[PDB]
Design a binder for this molecule. Structure first.
Ligand SMILES: [Zn+2]
Length: 263
């Protein structure tokens, strides 16, 4: 038997995939998760007791972004082990290809929250290696199911490249991506590149956006704005073609002004 469903905050969510909740927890049909500290519990009674006792009303670590009622928390895997393990086991219920749950010390986690009077409610996250050999600016990324396809996915994608720009490096998500992941990255890449070309080599676009040359090429390929000549990719842009494509912005965007972060 695997964990079939979770209660988190006011949400009931059915599992998509196996998640190795350890020992007797992994043998429970339903797990009850504190929406703040992400502690996983076996029974409604232990959950209700924890609701009254737990003092956490936000993720741990540093609030590195705040605009209106959207905030992003930076949680270092080394300083907040239990929290980051809890998050990885939650994420694995809804990510097929995530493989790391417990060995979290090498990772930083960026928690997207929407805030009200009660506290900061987890919407989604992405994990990131502190040191990436392959130059991955995102390890795993997820919007929790009840929040999917409402702008939040593209927000965390945007946020990951805002970090990469401040690092003065190029980045690509660790593959494979989910079907949703693939569509959201493509949409984001397109929006960024179209908005620039509306107003420059492929290298220039890579330095401006922190998007890899390969990701830019595949995006310009999908837009039919690149040609191949004697073994070189050539940008073939037409202001009418660019304006026609734009004829969309995500509901919420990352404001660099509201990002308080240094490498
Ligand atoms: Zn708690």
């Amino acid at each position: 038997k695997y964990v079939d469903k979770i209660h988190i905050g006011n949400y009931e969510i059915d599992a998509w995939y196996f998640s190795p909740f350890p020992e007797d927890y992994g043998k429970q049909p339903k797990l009850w998760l504190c929406e703040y500290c992400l502690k996983y519990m076996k029974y409604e009674k232990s959950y209700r007791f924890h609701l009254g006792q737990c003092q956490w009303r936000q993720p741990p670590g540093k609030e590195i972004y705040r605009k209106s009622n959207i905030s992003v928390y930076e949680v270092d895997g080394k300083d907040h082990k239990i929290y980051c393990q809890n998050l990885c086991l939650l994420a694995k219920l809804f990510l097929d290809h995530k493989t790391l749950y417990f060995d979290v010390e090498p990772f930083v986690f960026y928690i997207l929250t929407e805030v009200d009077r009660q506290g900061a409610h987890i919407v989604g996250y992405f994990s990131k290696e502190k040191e990436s050999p392959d130059g991955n600016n995102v390890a795993c990324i997820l919007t929790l199911p009840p929040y999917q396809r409402r702008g939040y996915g593209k927000f965390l994608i945007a946020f990951s490249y805002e970090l990469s720009k401040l690092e003065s490096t190029v980045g690509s998500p660790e593959k494979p991506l989910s079907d949703l992941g693939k569509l959201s990255y493509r949409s984001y890449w397109s929006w960024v590149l179209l908005e620039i070309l509306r107003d420059l080599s492929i290298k220039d676009l890579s330095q401006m956006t922190s998007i890899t040359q390969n990701d830019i090429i595949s995006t310009l390929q999908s837009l039919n704005m690149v040609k191949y000549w004697k073994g070189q990719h050539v940008i073939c842009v037409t202001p009418k073609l660019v304006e026609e494509h734009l004829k969309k912005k995500p509901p919420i965007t990352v404001d660099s002004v509201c990002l308080k972060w240094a490498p």
